[PDB]
Design a protein around this ligand. Sequence first.
Ligand SMILES: [K+]
Ligand SMILES: [Mg+2]
Ligand SMILES: [Mg+2]
Ligand SMILES: [Mg+2]
Ligand SMILES: [Mg+2]
Ligand SMILES: [Mg+2]
Ligand SMILES: [Mg+2]
Ligand SMILES: [Mg+2]
Ligand SMILES: [Mg+2]
Ligand SMILES: [Mg+2]
Ligand code: NA
Ligand code: NA
Ligand code: NA
Ligand code: NA
Ligand code: NA
Lengths: 395, 129, 151, 64
Amino acid sequence: HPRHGHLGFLPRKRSRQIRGRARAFPKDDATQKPHLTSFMVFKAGMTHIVRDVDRPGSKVNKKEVVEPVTILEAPPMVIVGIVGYRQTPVGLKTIGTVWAHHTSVEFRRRYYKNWKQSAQLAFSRQKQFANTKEGKVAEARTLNAFAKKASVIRVIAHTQLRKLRNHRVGVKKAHVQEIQVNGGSVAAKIALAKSLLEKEVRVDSVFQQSEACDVCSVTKGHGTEGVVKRWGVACLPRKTHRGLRKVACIGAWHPARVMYTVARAGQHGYHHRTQLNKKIYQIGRSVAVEPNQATTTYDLTAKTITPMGGFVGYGTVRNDYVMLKGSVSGPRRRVMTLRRPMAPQTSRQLKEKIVLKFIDTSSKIGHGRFQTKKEKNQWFGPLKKDRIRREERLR
Amino acid sequence: CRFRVSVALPVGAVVNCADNTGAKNLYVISVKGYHGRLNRLPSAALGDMVMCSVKKGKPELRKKVLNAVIIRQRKSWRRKDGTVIYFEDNAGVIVNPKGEMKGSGIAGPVAKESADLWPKISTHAPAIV
Amino acid sequence: IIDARKKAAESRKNRDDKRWKRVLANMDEEKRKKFHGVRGATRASLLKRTGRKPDAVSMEATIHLSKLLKKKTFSKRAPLAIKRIKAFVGRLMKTKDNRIDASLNTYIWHKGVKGVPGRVRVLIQRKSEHFYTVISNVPVASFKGLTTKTV
Amino acid sequence: MRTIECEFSHFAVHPGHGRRYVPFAFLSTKPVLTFSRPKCFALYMRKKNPRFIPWTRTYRRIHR
RNA sequence: GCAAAGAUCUAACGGAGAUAUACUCAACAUGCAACGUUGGAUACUGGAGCGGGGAAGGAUUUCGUGCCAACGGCACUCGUA
RNA sequence: GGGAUCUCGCAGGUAUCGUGAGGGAAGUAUGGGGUAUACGGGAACUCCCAUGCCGUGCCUCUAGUUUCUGGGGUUUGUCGAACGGCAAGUGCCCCGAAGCCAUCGCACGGUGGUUCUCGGCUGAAAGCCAGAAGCCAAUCCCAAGACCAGAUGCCCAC
RNA sequence: UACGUCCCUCUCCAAACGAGAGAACAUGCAUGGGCUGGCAUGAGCGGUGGGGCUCGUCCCGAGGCGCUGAACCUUGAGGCCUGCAUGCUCAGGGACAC
RNA sequence: AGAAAAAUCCGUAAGC
RNA sequence: GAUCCUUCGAUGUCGGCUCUUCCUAACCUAGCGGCUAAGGGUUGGAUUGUU
Ligand SMILES: [K+]
Ligand SMILES: [Mg+2]
Ligand SMILES: [Mg+2]
Ligand SMILES: [Mg+2]
Ligand SMILES: [Mg+2]
Ligand SMILES: [Mg+2]
Ligand SMILES: [Mg+2]
Ligand SMILES: [Mg+2]
Ligand SMILES: [Mg+2]
Ligand SMILES: [Mg+2]
Ligand code: NA
Ligand code: NA
Ligand code: NA
Ligand code: NA
Ligand code: NA
C-alpha cells in the first residue's frame, strides 16, 4: 500500500497570517510592457452555470454542460508607496520606500489596536517633512537610488473597506500588500509606479475574461483532529479494547523512537495553499453601473448576480466581482489573492474561449425553484396579507 | 470509452437477467479492467463487462462461468449536463467474450452509457433511456 | 478635547454638502457619489442626549428566548432561561440585583423543565433603597407588532 | 438548456436541479420522469393523487 | 480523580456569614461563593414503594433545648456528631 | 536617586511591510483516436480524448445526518371538558432548513541543469557533442538560536 | 512624562485552555416589519353526512365543505434588507509603560 | 571596539 | 546443526490485522544491445489456526 498523506505539506500547523500572500511572482520578461501582477478579492459564495463546449474530438463537443463557479467581490485598490530591491550575495535587500503625499484613514488604521481612543498621529511628521523643501530632495535621491541600483520594483496597495459595504466582514482597517511590477526596464517600471500613486486600480486592468490565474488563500479551520480525519488511516475492528480510531503500531523496536513520518493527532485546517490554474469565466461591473449582471445572450431575464435571499452568511454583492470556475480554499468573507499564472498556458483547455448561456440565481436556502421574485409572484397570486394591506390602504 | 459512472455492484451482488436465454439471476464474480488496491472490492457500473454465474435458471447453463454486460442500476449517477438519473432495478445481459449477445431480445429499457460501448446490444434494445 | 474632536474637524468636513450641491446642480445625473452625496455615524446625529435618566424607570420588553436556548440540555432548559433573563435585564439596567417575580417564575416553568416558551413579555421596574429591579410577566395574546416601550 | 415540469407537482425544474427516474413498467411516450424534491417522489411512490394535495398545480387549477 | 440511582427554581424571613472601597464617581466594569425555615411552582418514588409494623443483630442511635473545635471524603446557621 | 549596610538608575518601547540560510518535498499507471499506411498478415514518433490510483481542497447540484424536539400526525396515562399542553431519561411515525460531510457529489495537480549504460566527432589517451533512469535546483510547505547594520510609522532618550 | 500596549466589556472567518481575526457611541446591541425558505390548511363559527331520537320542524353523529397556500416557525455555534422602523448608550473603568 | 554601509547640495573615486 | 558467552529476586511465545521505514541478486513500468536503473507499483476470494 502507499502511505497516507503528503510529506511535502508538513508541518500541519496554523498559518502565520489570515491573508493569502504570494511567496513568489511570475518570471520577469523585459520585452513586454510594465503591468501589475496581483489583486485582492473577497469570497462570497457559489453557484453554477450552463455552457456549450468547443472541444474537437470529444464525446461532449458541441454539447451543453453544467459547471459550478465561485463568486469573489473585488472593489478597487489604492496605491500608496513604491519599494525597490537590490541583489546581494545573501539575498534581496530593500533600498527604501517612497510614500504618497496623502494617505487615508483606513490605511492608517492598520497601525493601531484601538484607533478611536488614540491620538492618531501616524504619518504626521512624514507629511510635514514631505511638504518642506528637504523632503523633495530626499524623495529625488531615493528615486535615483532605485533607478541606479535596483532590479525589482514593487508598489504598496491596500483595500478600501468602506467601498465594500459589508455588514458581516467586521474589519475596518485596510489589508496591505506588495504587488510586483513586471515587464520593461527599471526606468519604465519606476515611471509606471510614479504614475499610479494615490490612484485607484480595478481588477479588469489586471485580468482579462478568459484567462487563468492562481489563488493564494488560507484553508477553513477545524481545530484538533484525530488521525482518521487528519491523515486518512483505517478504523480498527469493532472488537477492539481502548478504541478504534487510532493507529495500531507507531514504530518498530529499532530505531527506538517515533519517526516524523508517522500519523499523530493535532491541528487540521487553517493552512496556506496556492491552487494553480483557476479559469475565470466573467468579470462583472458594479450593480450601480450595470444592473443586469446575470443576463446573457440566450437568457434575456433581467437579474443581478446575488441569489434570491442573498448569499448565505455574507449578504449582497455591491461592487465588481470575478467568476472563477470551481472552488477555492477558505470560507466566505475571507480575503484572497489573485496572481498571474506560473504554469505554461498552451493547453487547449487553458486556451478555450468561454461563452455563458445561463447563470443560476435561485435561493440557496432550502431548494430554490424560482429564478426571480417576479416568477415567484407569477406562480402564487395575491395572498391574504396583500389583500389586507390593500384594504387598509383603501381605508 | 465513456465518462464516469458511480460504481454500484460490488463482488457478490445478484442482478436480474434481462435476456431470454432461460437465466433468471446473475452472480457477480469479478469486473474486467479492474486494477487492484488493498482491501477494496471490485465494483461494476453501466457498460461494464463482468464474470458471472447463473444461480437460478435452466440447468444447462448453471454451474459455470460466463460473461455479461450491465445495462441498469439503482445507484444514481450524474451526467455531464448535470442530470441525475437512476433506474428501478439492476439488470444484465449474457454476452460473448467479444460482446456478441447470447439470446435475441431484451426486456426493459437500456442506458445510453452502455448502448454506446456495445453496438450489438443497442440493436435489440427496446428503448434507450 | 472632546469638543475639539466632535464638530471642529468633523463639522468642517461637512462642507462637502456645499460641494455636492454645486456639482449636482450643474446638470449632472447618475454620478457615483460616496462621501456625502451623508454626515454618517447615525449615532452622532440621531442621539439627542436627553440626559442622565431618573432612578425610577419602568420598561416593557420582549425577549426572544428560543434563540438563547437552542440544542441545550433538556434537563437544564428552564434554569438556564432564568439565568439568561437575569443577565439580559442586568445588562439593560446596569444593576447586579435583579429579582424574579412569582408570575414570571410560574410562566417560565409552566410547561415543565423542557417546554420553556419561545418568547416572553416582561415589565421591568428599577428601584432605589443601592439599586435593584423587579421583573414580572405581562400576559399577551400575541407577540406581533410589539416593541420596547416606557411606562 | 431547457426547463421541465415536475411529474407530481408541475413545479419548474431549471438546469442543474432535481432527479430523474426510469420505472421498469415504462411508458413508451414518457420513459423518464422528473422530480424536483424528495417530497414529490415520496408522495408518488405512496401512489397519492395530486388533485387532493392542496399545494400542487393540478389542485390549484381544479379549485381556484 | 470526587461521572449508577433523571432535578430543581422563586420570594420573604433568619443568620457574623454583607449591599464589606483609598477617593472621584449614580449605578455595571472593585465582597465572590455557599446555608436553614415558611409560602408558591416543577418533578420523582409508583402498593414486589427513599410507605406503616416485627424477628435476628445493635443498645440510648429516641425526645427537647443549645452548640458548631473535630467528624458527616463538597458545604452547613443543620446532624444518628 | 533610591534602596540594602555596596547596587544599579541613567534606554529603548510599540506597530506594519519584507529577505530567505537551513529543513521538508510528489505525482504515477492503463486504454482509445489519428498517423494507417511502411515491411511483406502487420508497425512507430509529433499530436488529441478519456479513465484508475495517489495528493490538496470545496459545498452550487445529488446523497447521508436533525436536540431548529421546526410544522404535522398518532398511542397509553393525566390536569372536570374544549383550548393549551404535559409524562413515557428525545413515546413513536412523515416531511424538514442551516451546518457538517461522500471516489455517493464537484475543482485543481508546472520548469530547467548534470551524469551514467550507450552512440558519436577530432585525435594520439586526451579535448568537444548528444544523452531513459537517477541526482541537483526551481515552483510548493515551515522558516532569524541563521540572533536580518533589511525598509518603514509614532513616542521617548541623547 | 509621552506614544502606546494589555485586562474587564462586545463580535465570530479562530478556538480543549492559551493563542487568533475584529470593534471600541459603532445599524454596535435589542425588539418589530419586509424578504427568502419549511410544514401543509390554525382557534372559532356556520348552512354535506352512514344512521338514530323526539314533536313539516327540533336535536345526537365519525367524517366533509367555507372563511383559509390558513396558522405557526425562520439565526440562535451566530440566513438577507437601513446606498426597512424604532429603542438603549450620556466623561467607559483598571493595570503597566514609569 | 570587525557593517556583503558611506567616503550649497544635485548630478559627476573625472573634468564639475 | 554445533556450542553454552549474557539473562532463572522473570527481557510476555505462533499467525493475522494496523502502520512506517530500508535493501536488491529487477516481476511490471523506463532506456539501450544480455546491460543500465531501487524512482513509482505489486490485487480479491474458496478450504485450513496457520507461515
Ligand atoms: K532546499
Ligand atoms: Mg483534575
Ligand atoms: Mg466530577
Ligand atoms: Mg469514576
Ligand atoms: Mg412516575
Ligand atoms: Mg413490577
Ligand atoms: Mg467535609
Ligand atoms: Mg437538634
Ligand atoms: Mg468556526
Ligand atoms: Mg544444539
Ligand atoms: Na476486550
Ligand atoms: Na484484506
Ligand atoms: Na447522577
Ligand atoms: Na408527573
Ligand atoms: Na413530551
